[PDB]
Amino acid sequence: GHLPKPTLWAEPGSVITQGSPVTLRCQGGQETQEYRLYREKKTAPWITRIPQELVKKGQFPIPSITWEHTGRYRCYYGSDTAGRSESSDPLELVVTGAYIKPTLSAQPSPVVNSGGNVTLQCDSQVAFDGFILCKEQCLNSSSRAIFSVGPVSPSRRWWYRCYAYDSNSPYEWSLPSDLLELLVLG
């Protein structure tokens, strides 16, 4: 048989502010209907609540996301009996807004030359053991983290936001830092 691995994504995205809606989506074959979504390590009861009418379209909506929804998800279609596809690449569903927002700055500055590298610093008013830098994807880093980005170029937009988080609950992030725009001389 041949049941290609499905694509899994979230709308509007995988990083959602607490209380906002998000819909996880799975795309298998053109006629696929037997979609299955699941969370790694801990079962997600909210999935069992999804109407079959939506499941068949690969739609798994969360009207108002909460801390309980966060986690690593994967989807596949079919069954052991009828035959199933491999599981999709993982999607890390994260909720933001759990902590005060950090500040993001560029060193030496936000204005750099094409081809140059810049250091981005995420500073928090209090201690956190983890920081995230997302390009508006994201990457992981006692109240500040340093990230290196580049080579930068004028042909692309360089917008960033950073977050602070606690390693004991890695899928819940702080409020996002203000957006930082790098200006590339070019």
Domain boundary among 43, 66, 96: 96
List the resolution, Å. 1.8
Distance CA 124, CA 127 (A): 7
* Of 152, 146, 150, 115, nearest in space to 133 by CA: 146
Instruction: Specify the number of domains making up the chain.
Output: 2
133 and 157 belong to one structural domain: yes
List phi, psi (to 5°) of 119: -95, 125
Which residues, at least 6 apart from 99, have a Cβ–Cβ distance to it below 8 Å?
128, 164, 165, 166, 173, 174, 175
The residue range of the domain holding 102 is: 97-186
Are the beta carbons of 3 and 34 closer than 8 angstroms? Answer: no
89 and 116 belong to one structural domain: no
What is the secondary structure of 26-81 as a DSSP string? EE--TT---EEEEESSS--HHHHTS-HHHHTTTEEEESS--GGG-EEEEEEEEETT
6 and 92 belong to one structural domain: yes
Are the beta carbons of 177 and 137 closer than 8 angstroms? Answer: no
List phi, psi (to 5°) of 157: -95, 135
Are the beta carbons of 121 and 136 closer than 8 angstroms? Answer: no
81 and 129 belong to one structural domain: no
Domain boundary among 43, 71, 96: 96
Distance CA 122, CA 133 (A): 8
Domain boundary among 96, 115, 141: 96
Cβ-in-10-Å burial (0-12, 13-18, 19+) of 62 comes to buried
106 and 122 belong to one structural domain: yes
Residue 118 backbone class (left: φ over 0; alpha: ψ -120 to 50; beta: rest): beta
CATH code of residue 125: 2.60.40.10
Which residues, at least 6 apart from 168, have a Cβ–Cβ distance to it below 8 Å?
none
89 and 106 belong to one structural domain: no
Are the beta carbons of 26 and 87 closer than 8 angstroms? Answer: no
73 and 142 belong to one structural domain: no
104 and 88 belong to one structural domain: no
Distance CA 34, CA 56 (A): 6
Amino acid at 105: S
Assigned token pair, 102: 């950090």
6 and 50 belong to one structural domain: yes
23 and 108 belong to one structural domain: no
Please, which experimental method was used? Answer: X-ray
Starting at the earlier edge strand, list the strands of the sheet with 118-123. Answer: 103-107, 118-123, 144-149
